[PDB]
């Protein structure tokens with residue numbers, strides 16, 4: 126397929142098929158990769174980078190998919206900056222929405238807790254990353270650190286896990302009594318019913334599955 130990117134040479138550009146009417150410059154033997162976020166082509170310099178750290182990262186270190194943001198800046202509605210070190214990743218203004226178990230009731234409790242204390246999702250993440258680095262908090266992508274260069278989706282995934290642990294460590298006395306009065310749901314954090322308003326309000330879902338007595 127013919128591909129013209131931001132950094133392609135003019136002669137390539139003018140040789141593409143015309144429309145229908147009613148510092149880097151790409152080398153010939155080079156290739157392009159499509160940004161996973163904006164779908165636009167960029168020169169694929171990953172191999173080059175493996176032996177030359179001066180080239181900007183072009184992929185998430187977790188999912189290994191290509192993203193163009195660090196390389197030359199990505200632009201798309203919905204893109205907040207799709208590749209960054211975890212500690213600097215833009216998760217978006219609504220990142221607290223359903224951040225706990227995809228559960229709006231539980232998530233709103235955390236939002237209220239943070240707002241009451243003048244804290245941001247940013248403050249929460251910074252605090253969580255400290256716990257992560259000491260091995261107090263844990264991640265499924267267990268080798269991710271605050272310094273890991275990752276994408277929006279992978280960052281969001283780990284942010285949810287860190288945030289759950291953050292919430293877990295809030296003392297009951299620091300939350301409204303209406304929150305702490307609710308009994309634990311038998312099925313815990315993975316409960317399938319908590320996406321339903323009534324069930325979410327009735328039971329606490331910041332807990333683990335009940336197994337034995």
Ligand SMILES: Nc1ncnc2c1ncn2[C@@H]1O[C@H](COP(=O)(O)OP(=O)(O)O)[C@@H](O)[C@H]1O
Nearest residue numbers: 307308309310311312313316318328329335338
């Ligand atoms: N319909 C339900 N759905 C989810 N969790 C429930 C339900 N009914 C009770 N639970 C919760 O399950 C947990 C264990 O309750 P249960 O098995 O009845 O033993 P116990 O008699 O010790 O409460 C309790 O926290 C309770 O709040």
Ligand SMILES: [Zn+2]
Nearest residue numbers: 130132133151
């Ligand atoms: Zn190009």
Ligand SMILES: [Zn+2]
Nearest residue numbers: 185188276279
């Ligand atoms: Zn990723």
Ligand SMILES: [Zn+2]
Nearest residue numbers: 160163193199
């Ligand atoms: Zn992009």
Ligand SMILES: [Zn+2]
Nearest residue numbers: 162199204207
């Ligand atoms: Zn993007």
Ligand SMILES: [Zn+2]
Nearest residue numbers: 310316318319
């Ligand atoms: Zn439940």
